[PDB]
Design a protein around this nucleic acid. Sequence first.
DNA 1: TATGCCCAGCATCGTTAATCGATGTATATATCTGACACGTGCCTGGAGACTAGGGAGTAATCCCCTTGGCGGTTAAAACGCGGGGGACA
Length: 82
Amino acid sequence: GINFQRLDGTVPSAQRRISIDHFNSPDSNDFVFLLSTRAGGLGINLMTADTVVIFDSDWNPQADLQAMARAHRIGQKNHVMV
DNA sequence: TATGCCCAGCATCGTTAATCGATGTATATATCTGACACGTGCCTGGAGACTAGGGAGTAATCCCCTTGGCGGTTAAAACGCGGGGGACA
């Protein structure tokens, strides 16, 4: 029972856009959001988010460094956690 | 003289026994052919023995090619609906 949405490599521009905003709005319930390495770090920014967790290194140095870049941006007012 | 009576006389039927011949069944012998093994004779195409050499084995290095992963469009596969025309009787 935890409210979420997924962020894959398979989604229409219109549908991708709807949720990204739904998420950074002031009063959004879902604190769980799952993303891709190339599809996740693709672009965008997450300003509400503080914690980011890595299952496995992304066969390379730095795909992760941007992967955290989407969440760790100028706005975030809640430190950061990785 | 004709008509019933005595004394032979071969063919009718059936039954017994000996005989020539056909059929069925052994039983040891004399052909028929078809060999497979051996020794006869000879050739050399293989075996046996030795050499020499170059192919192929292996090992050590290289670098090209094949597989992989990924993501964007953009055609293609997929589906269905509908009804016509070919299959099949």
